[PDB]
Amino acid sequence: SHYKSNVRDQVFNLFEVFGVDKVLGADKFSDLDADTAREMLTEIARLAEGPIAESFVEGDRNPPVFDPETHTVTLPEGFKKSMRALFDGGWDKVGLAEHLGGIPMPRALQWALIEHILGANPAAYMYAMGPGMSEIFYNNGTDEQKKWATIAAERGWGATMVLTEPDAGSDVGAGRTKAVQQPDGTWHIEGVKRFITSADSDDLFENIMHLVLARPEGAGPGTKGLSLFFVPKFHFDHETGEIGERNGVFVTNVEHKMGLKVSATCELSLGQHGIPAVGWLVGEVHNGIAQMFDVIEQARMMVGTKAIATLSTGYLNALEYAKERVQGADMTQMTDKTAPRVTITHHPDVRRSLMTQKAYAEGLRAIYLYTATFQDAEVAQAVHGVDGDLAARVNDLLLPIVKGFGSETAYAKLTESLQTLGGSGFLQDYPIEQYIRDSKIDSLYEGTTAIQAQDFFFRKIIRDKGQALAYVAGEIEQFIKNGRLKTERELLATALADVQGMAASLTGYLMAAQEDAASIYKVGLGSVRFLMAVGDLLSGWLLARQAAVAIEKLDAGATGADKSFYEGKIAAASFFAKNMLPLLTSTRQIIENLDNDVMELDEAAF
């Protein structure tokens, strides 16, 4: 199959670096032990490498077909077979609450399991997000709505998040879809939404729960005026779940995309076909953007994990290719035109490329798993000694890194993966060109990189009063202040100071905006580079932490494949510190010298 997994690195992170096994068999996870967690990782990785990856090519080459008269999509049969393999193993219920039929587990294990589906066929996981979205509806719902959410989860209904409109993408608060209150307390939703993932899904599911943002008639402007509504594809019996009459919510177009083709990306028309789109106000309160961000937070974690998953299998495909491809002589024998030909892993530029791919893939894996350790209060306490409030703020700080830095990094470093194959990398015979096309969406949906970087600075640092950022910086400082990693710790110290300098510069521009409003533009100009710098710093630190563990295991006497694995962690941490981190010094100097010339330029001059 195309999909090459890395359970070994996952288990290294979960158990040898972060110690998530400390909570297994205790309190919420009393019924899940470490051996079982490992077995589940191996099991889903095998399922991903087999039946799920089997339709990865098919979904792209034979993409979904829309019938505009039935407002339905037909998915390729091979992809539906992969979906059934996912459902038959219960993998659309990973980490679902126990009362909804799930297996309780730390979020760090949950996302490690999901990584394999996202690497093998990411749209398959997207289609399978229904039960998790039903749990969010449960948590935000009235007692009666919790009964519907239980049905939806138990029956495996699909689900969507429905926000975007043609004129309201990044600016969610500009949305014009309306909600009209009915005497009996239901609402009729009227509007056209766009770019809705999974808004129809062929016959995968008995029903779909649309979670729709809409503006009640007479509500105020902006996101504050928006409410969230449960809008099912089919009406249903609220006691038994029996599916009833079709609700007035119809797909009216399916986009032709660069990649992720098997994910139906839809225009969704509500109340436009002479049938009301009945919706129920979630929680029977008007609090839409707050409620919908429970969904957005999960989707941003998913997109980041998808990016990392895809870079990982891209790297491992490139590595396998490089080990076998014979081309050229060793550089030490270039002059000799009779020298033996060698496999291309002998060439310095190929080893540079591979170690770049490796270090970023493994640094990103460490980042999303680190982030997830703050998503359970019990895990954050056991592994970090951090209380619930701080853990939540740290998770909030890291999500735009997982999403924003992960999405940008994975796409960029897949360029190196493709390059490693030479001309063959341009062929559809190999999976890397599809990885690139499928990953380009990651920087765009669930909030563009610029929106992630604005969220990160203004909301996760400034509004947070820097508490979460100071916590993470303190952990990096402690690592620095703890022989064989001295050069790496010195390089990390410089990188930490560089990022601190960037944060101070941008905060200074924000303060200056009290006096000259246009000074705020300099925050915008520097925001994305600052986000990427924090990502690089975290990557280098977590890689260096991994190298410290690897040194310990090597000193203790690791042999064989274990020894090679640990040796590679040391090499990745050292390579990243020496080749990636120093660039942050120049980025700091650039951010310190930002000016508004590019903002004052006449638009006609571009």
Catalytic positions, please? 446
Q: Which does 160 bind (CB under 5 to 8 A by kind): ligand FAD, its own copies, none?
A: ligand FAD
Give the C-alpha separation, 425 to 435, whole Å: 11
Quote the least distance from Cβ 419 to its own copies, whole Å. 6
Give the C-alpha separation, 187 to 190, whole Å: 10
Quote the least distance from Cβ 254 to ligand FAD, whole Å. 11
- The answer to whether 91 touches 50, Cβ cutoff 8 Å, is no
- Bridge partners for 212 per DSSP: 162, 229
272 binds ligand FAD (CB under 6 A): no
Task: Write the single-letter amino acid at 397.
Answer: L
Nearer to ligand FAD among residue 13 and residue 207 (C-beta): 207
Q: Which of 18, 445, 530, 566 binds ligand FAD (CB under 6 A)?
A: 445
411 binds ligand FAD (CB under 6 A): no
Strands (E), 303-346: 326-329, 341-343
Quote the least distance from Cβ 141 to ligand FAD, whole Å. 20
CB-count burial class (<10 Å; 0-12, 13-18, 19+) for 258: exposed
> Could you tell me the sign of the dihedral formed by the alpha carbons of 17, 22, 24, 29, in that order?
negative
Q: Which of residues 350-409 bind ligand FAD (CB under 6 A)?
A: 350
Q: Which does 571 bind (CB under 5 to 8 A by kind): its own copies, ligand FAD, none?
A: its own copies
- The answer to whether 530 touches 502, Cβ cutoff 8 Å, is yes
Q: Which does 471 bind (CB under 5 to 8 A by kind): its own copies, ligand FAD, none?
A: none
Cβ neighbours of residue 416 closer than 8 Å, sequence gap 6 or more = 318, 353, 354, 356, 357
The window from 423-431, 502-510, 531-539, 570-578 that contacts ligand FAD (CB under 6 A) reads 423-431
Q: Which of 20, 344, 399, 572 binds ligand FAD (CB under 6 A)?
A: 344
What is the DSSP code string of 447-505?
S-HHHHHHIIIIIIIITTTTHHHHHHHHHHHHHHH--TTHHHHHHHHHHHHHHHHHHHH
The window from 190-198, 279-287, 509-517, 542-550 that contacts ligand FAD (CB under 6 A) reads 190-198
Q: Are strands 249-254 and 227-232 parallel, antiparallel or unpaired?
A: unpaired
Q: Which does 578 bind (CB under 5 to 8 A by kind): its own copies, ligand FAD, none?
A: its own copies
The window from 159-167, 219-227, 272-280, 540-548 that contacts ligand FAD (CB under 6 A) reads 159-167
Q: Which residue pairs from 292-298 have beta carbons closer than 8 angstroms and sit at least 24 positions apart in sequence?
A: 292/161, 292/163, 292/211, 292/213, 292/226, 292/228, 294/136, 294/139, 294/140, 295/133, 295/136, 295/161, 295/211, 296/161, 296/446, 296/447, 297/399, 298/129, 298/132, 298/133, 298/136
Quote the least distance from Cβ 434 to its own copies, whole Å. 8
191 binds ligand FAD (CB under 6 A): no
Q: Which does 342 bind (CB under 5 to 8 A by kind): ligand FAD, its own copies, none?
A: none
Q: List b or e across 98-123, with b for residues whose CB sees 16 or more CB atoms inside 10 angstroms.
A: eebebbbbbbbbbbbbbbbbbbbbbb
163 binds ligand FAD (CB under 6 A): yes
448 binds ligand FAD (CB under 6 A): yes
Count of Cβ atoms closer than 10 Å to residue 429 Cβ: 10
Quote the least distance from Cβ 60 to ligand FAD, whole Å. 14
Q: Which does 196 bind (CB under 5 to 8 A by kind): its own copies, ligand FAD, none?
A: ligand FAD
For the chain, the first-to-last Cα distance in angstroms comes to 47
Q: Which of 50, 78, 173, 328 binds ligand FAD (CB under 6 A)?
A: 328
Quote the least distance from Cβ 358 to its own copies, whole Å. 6
- HSE-up of 331 (CA within 13 Å, CB side)? 8
267 binds ligand FAD (CB under 6 A): no
450 binds ligand FAD (CB under 6 A): yes
Q: Which of residues 30-49 bind ligand FAD (CB under 6 A)?
A: none
Q: Residues in contact with ligand FAD, total (CB under 6 A)?
A: 32
Q: Which of 70, 139, 333, 424 binds ligand FAD (CB under 6 A)?
A: 424
Q: Which does 447 bind (CB under 5 to 8 A by kind): ligand FAD, its own copies, none?
A: ligand FAD
Does residue 222 come out as left (phi exceeding 0), alpha (psi in the -120 to 50 range) or beta? left
Q: Which of 349, 389, 429, 490 binds ligand FAD (CB under 6 A)?
A: 349
- The answer to whether 157 touches 206, Cβ cutoff 8 Å, is yes
- Bridge partners for 67 per DSSP: 72
Q: Measure Cα distances from 160 to 122, 200, 398 in Å.
A: 16, 9, 24
Nearer to ligand FAD among residue 147 and residue 257 (C-beta): 257
Q: Which does 259 bind (CB under 5 to 8 A by kind): its own copies, ligand FAD, none?
A: its own copies
223 binds ligand FAD (CB under 6 A): no
Helix (H) or strand (E) holding 287: none
591 binds ligand FAD (CB under 6 A): no
Give the C-alpha separation, 255 to 66, whole Å: 10
Nearer to its own copies among residue 87 and residue 565 (C-beta): 565
The window from 48-56, 164-172, 309-317, 374-382 that contacts ligand FAD (CB under 6 A) reads 164-172
Give the C-alpha separation, 119 to 111, whole Å: 12
Nearer to its own copies among residue 239 and residue 603 (C-beta): 603
Quote the least distance from Cβ 387 to its own copies, whole Å. 31
Quote the least distance from Cβ 21 to ligand FAD, whole Å. 35
Task: Specify the 3-state DSSP secondary structure of 548.
Answer: helix
164 binds ligand FAD (CB under 6 A): yes
Quote the least distance from Cβ 426 to its own copies, whole Å. 5
Phi/psi for 63 (5° steps) reads -75, 170
Angle between helices 406-420 and 432-439 (to 10 degrees): 160
441 binds ligand FAD (CB under 6 A): yes
Q: Which of 170, 428, 487, 586 binds ligand FAD (CB under 6 A)?
A: 170
Positions in the binding site for ligand FAD (CB under 6 A): 160-164, 169-170, 195-197, 257, 265, 325, 327-328, 344, 347, 349-350, 419-420, 422-424, 426, 441, 444-448, 450
